[PDB]
Structures are given as C-alpha cells and as structure tokens.
Design a protein around this motif. Structure first.
Motif, PDB file in Angstrom:
ATOM      1  N   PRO A 153      50.885  59.247   9.124  1.00 45.17           N
ATOM      2  CA  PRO A 153      52.087  59.009   9.806  1.00 45.17           C
ATOM      3  C   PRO A 153      52.441  60.256  10.850  1.00 45.17           C
ATOM      4  O   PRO A 153      52.874  59.935  12.020  1.00 45.17           O
ATOM      5  CB  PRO A 153      53.310  58.665   8.817  1.00 45.17           C
ATOM      6  CG  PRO A 153      52.878  59.238   7.678  1.00 45.17           C
ATOM      7  CD  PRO A 153      51.309  59.314   7.683  1.00 45.17           C
ATOM      8  N   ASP A 154      52.289  61.638  10.356  1.00 49.19           N
ATOM      9  CA  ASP A 154      52.462  62.721  11.010  1.00 49.19           C
ATOM     10  C   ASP A 154      51.451  62.795  12.095  1.00 49.19           C
ATOM     11  O   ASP A 154      51.844  63.223  13.584  1.00 49.19           O
ATOM     12  CB  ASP A 154      52.175  64.099  10.011  1.00 49.19           C
ATOM     13  CG  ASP A 154      52.391  65.251  11.096  1.00 49.19           C
ATOM     14  OD1 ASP A 154      52.749  65.112  12.041  1.00 49.19           O
ATOM     15  OD2 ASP A 154      51.655  66.258  10.607  1.00 49.19           O
ATOM     16  N   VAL A 155      50.244  62.343  11.986  1.00 50.40           N
ATOM     17  CA  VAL A 155      49.048  62.478  12.821  1.00 50.40           C
ATOM     18  C   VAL A 155      49.408  61.161  13.894  1.00 50.40           C
ATOM     19  O   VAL A 155      48.844  61.341  15.031  1.00 50.40           O
ATOM     20  CB  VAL A 155      47.655  62.337  12.236  1.00 50.40           C
ATOM     21  CG1 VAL A 155      46.466  62.535  13.478  1.00 50.40           C
ATOM     22  CG2 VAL A 155      47.562  63.691  11.236  1.00 50.40           C
ATOM     23  N   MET A 156      49.693  60.228  13.185  1.00 52.41           N
ATOM     24  CA  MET A 156      49.723  58.829  13.864  1.00 52.41           C
ATOM     25  C   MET A 156      50.721  59.155  15.350  1.00 52.41           C
ATOM     26  O   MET A 156      50.488  58.845  16.343  1.00 52.41           O
ATOM     27  CB  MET A 156      50.388  57.881  13.297  1.00 52.41           C
ATOM     28  CG  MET A 156      50.142  56.400  13.760  1.00 52.41           C
ATOM     29  SD  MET A 156      48.551  56.247  14.125  1.00 52.41           S
ATOM     30  CE  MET A 156      47.841  55.279  12.930  1.00 52.41           C
ATOM     31  N   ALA A 157      52.039  59.830  14.948  1.00 52.56           N
ATOM     32  CA  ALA A 157      52.793  60.078  15.907  1.00 52.56           C
ATOM     33  C   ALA A 157      52.302  61.241  16.837  1.00 52.56           C
ATOM     34  O   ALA A 157      52.779  61.280  18.106  1.00 52.56           O
ATOM     35  CB  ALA A 157      54.111  60.758  15.156  1.00 52.56           C
ATOM     36  N   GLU A 158      51.626  62.156  16.395  1.00 45.84           N
ATOM     37  CA  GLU A 158      50.895  63.166  17.523  1.00 45.84           C
ATOM     38  C   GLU A 158      49.708  62.560  18.262  1.00 45.84           C
ATOM     39  O   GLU A 158      49.589  62.639  19.484  1.00 45.84           O
ATOM     40  CB  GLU A 158      50.191  64.337  16.516  1.00 45.84           C
ATOM     41  CG  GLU A 158      49.831  65.453  17.322  1.00 45.84           C
ATOM     42  CD  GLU A 158      49.375  66.750  16.555  1.00 45.84           C
ATOM     43  OE1 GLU A 158      49.449  66.412  15.318  1.00 45.84           O
ATOM     44  OE2 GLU A 158      49.307  67.658  16.970  1.00 45.84           O
TER      45      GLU A 158
END
Lengths: 52, 52
Positions: free
Chosen positions: B3-8
């Motif tokens: 989810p950290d990379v999804m937002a990035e």
C-alpha cells in the motif's frame, strides 16, 4: 487528442506552383507592349489545399 | 505492490497521465526560379573570299 464533440485539423498541405517561360527575340521581345509579338510565352499555375 | 508503493505509484501515474498538449505545425516552403539565356551569332560566307 480531440474533445468528444469537436471536428479538428489532423494535418494538411497547401501547395502552390507557378512556372513561367518565354522564348523571345533579345531586344525586340522586351518592348513593353509590341514585344509580346516577338515572345512566345508559356505560363502555368496550380493550387492544392488539402485538409484532414 | 505494498500500500506504501500503491500510493507512490498513484502519484507517478497521475503525473505520467497528464493531458499531453497538441501542436499545430505549419511549414512554408517558398521557392522562386528564372534565368535568361541569350544566343546571338552572325555568320558571313563568301564564295570568293571565305566563310565563318
């Protein structure tokens, strides 16, 4: 990329050509009015306006 | 992705999906051509004396 309703220009070519030729007698062909009696002129012109 | 990379990835995508602007490019090719040939020449032929 065009709006869903709108009619637009993709591209186009507006091409214009004019070829002018005379076969005249050197001095006599240059008399501004009479001179046209010595000269055998061949003129040509063209136009193409293409819009997509 | 996480989810950290999804937002990035979601910011990368938003920047990368920007409405690419359109360009109308008119070229103008103008050519002009002419020129003057001249052939004048005088020949004298004489039976008695000689010819040129």
């Amino acid at each position: 990329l065009v709006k869903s309703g709108e009619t637009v220009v993709l591209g186009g070519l507006m091409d214009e050509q004019t070829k002018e030729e005379v076969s005249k007698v050197p001095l006599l062909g240059d008399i501004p009015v009479l001179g046209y009696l010595f000269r055998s002129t061949s003129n040509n012109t063209s136009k193409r306006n293409l819009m997509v | 992705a996480q989810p950290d990379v999804m937002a990035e990835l979601e910011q990368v995508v938003a920047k990368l999906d920007i409405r690419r602007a359109q360009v109308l490019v008119e070229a103008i090719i103008v050519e002009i051509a002419d020129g003057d040939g001249l052939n004048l020449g005088v020949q004298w032929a004489n039976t008695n004396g000689g010819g040129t």
